Structures are given as C-alpha cells and as structure tokens.
Design a protein around this ligand. Structure first.
Ligand SMILES: N=C(N)c1ccc2cc(/C=C/c3cccc(CCO)c3)ccc2c1
Length: 246
C-alpha cells in the first residue's frame, strides 16, 4: 500500500496473510486474502498459478505484522487450493483473478472467530457501490514501487471507485479493463494498492453493510496518474464461489 496508514488486524479481522515455504525451509510473503467463512479464504489466482502446490502455503488469520506472532493469531495449512479454470493474464489485465483456499489448523480445524478473526460478507448480485464510493484496501504490499521489502506492519488506505466508462478511457486502460473488473483510485493519485497487496480485500460499506466488493488484482505501476488499481468484481463470481465452497 502506497500512502495510507499503518493499522492492526483488529481493524481488518477478515484479513488473511498468505506465505509460501520454499525448499530449504525459508518462508516468504505471497499475497493477502479474505476470510469469507471459517474454512475459506478468498484471494487471487495470479498469486498461486506459478506455484500451485497447496502444501507450500501458510495462511495466518489475526496477524498484524509480517514477522511477528500477533497475540490471538491462528496458523493454517491449505487443505484445498482452488484456482479459477478460466484464469488468464494479458500484458496488464488478469482475467478471472480469483482463488479459494480451504484452511486447516494442524488439528484439522477451521478458523475460530474472535475479536481479531472475523469473516467479511460477500456482495449480492447486481448490487455493487456506485462510482465515487469510498472503499478501503488492506495489505502488506509495497509502500513504494522502488521498494523490494514489504512493510513490517499492516497498512490500509481509502480509495474511490471509478466507473467502467472512465476506466476505459484511452489514457486509463482502454478496452483492457472489462465489466468483470472494478477500478478504484485516489483522485490525487497519492495512495493505491501495490505489489504484494494482490489477493487482498477491497471492502466497501454498502447500505450500512461492510462488503467484500473486490480483490486486489492488477494495475499499471502503483499510484500512477490515470492508472487505477484494478480489482476482481466479487459480485460476478457469486455462482463460482458458491459452487466451489459447497
Ligand atoms: N496499481 C495497483 N493497485 C496495483 C495492483 C496490483 C499489483 C500487482 C502487482 C503484481 C506483481 C507480481 C505478480 C506475480 C509475481 C511477481 C514477482 C514476484 O515478486 C510480481 C504489481 C503491481 C500492482 C499494482
């Protein structure tokens, strides 16, 4: 996250921290995720497509820091890694950028909801917020595009939804951004999601209800003028999520 503020897991309790174990035993951060039900984390397929072995991943819930065992955190393995069959990547645009991770503690249990571990409600069909709506993003992603290290402390920011017609402008993304994708950005281009924020939540308060409107997917650079962050429109994937979590 470029700009924004530092935060803690208590303010983002649906936030999942996903890491990968490498041969030799080193563990690195991969992407963010969202708890949608106690056994299920939703994220982006692009985060896992090149390393699709479920055994390699570690999921934390209730974790506030990249390298701290936050009090109340829960560690999980991936019981089932579900990648979208129609996932694809163009030069910029990522299509069907959605993944489901069935989580399991070493005792075979799913998440235990607490003050720091909570689910985030899914959107309803054909009911996404209107353009100009403020939404929040959370992640351990880059603070600057020039950084190679991720922040130690979890960050969040607030961005505004951009209409499809504005996002299809030639100086924006033209026809590369589709109706299955949501653009969101800072009108001043100072805050945005960035590399390492992928898979993470775009949470919108809609009709008084805190909703998982999007999933951090793609963008041209980070906090670049006329280059919004592009998010998977979760409302389009309700049949896919339902069928794959049953
Ligand atoms: N402008 C944005 N909001 C935005 C959103 C998502 C982004 C996602 C990336 C992803 C980078 C990436 C993906 C897969 C592998 C790798 C190399 C391993 O570090 C890098 C980069 C910039 C981004 C910028």
């Amino acid at each position: 996250i470029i700009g924004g503020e530092f935060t803690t897991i208590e303010n983002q309790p649906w936030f999942a921290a996903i890491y990968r174990r490498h041969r030799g035993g080193s563990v690195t951060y991969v992407c963010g995720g969202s708890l949608i039900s106690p056994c299920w984390v939703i994220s982006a397929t692009h985060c896992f497509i090149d390393y699709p072995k479920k055994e390699d991943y570690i999921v934390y819930l209730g974790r506030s820091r990249l390298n701290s065992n936050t009090q109340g955190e829960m560690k999980f393995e991936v019981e089932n890694l579900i990648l979208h069959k129609d996932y694809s990547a163009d030069t910029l645009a990522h299509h069907n950028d959605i993944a489901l991770l069935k989580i399991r503690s070493k005792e075979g249990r799913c998440a235990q909801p607490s003050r720091t571990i909570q689910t985030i409600a899914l959107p309803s069909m054909y009911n996404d917020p209107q353009f100009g709506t403020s939404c929040e993003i959370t992640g351990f992603g880059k603070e600057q595009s020039t950084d190679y290290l991720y922040p130690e402390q979890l960050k969040m920011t607030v961005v505004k939804l951009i209409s499809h017609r504005e996002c299809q402008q030639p100086h924006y993304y033209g026809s590369e951004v589709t109706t299955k994708m949501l653009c969101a950005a800072d009108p001043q281009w100072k805050t945005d999601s960035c590399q390492g924020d992928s898979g993470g939540p775009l949470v919108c308060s809609l009709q008084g209800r805190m909703t998982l409107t999007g999933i951090v997917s793609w963008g041209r650079g980070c906090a670049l003028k006329d280059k919004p962050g592009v998010y998977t429109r979760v409302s389009h994937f309700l049949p896919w999520i339902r069928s794959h979590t049953k």
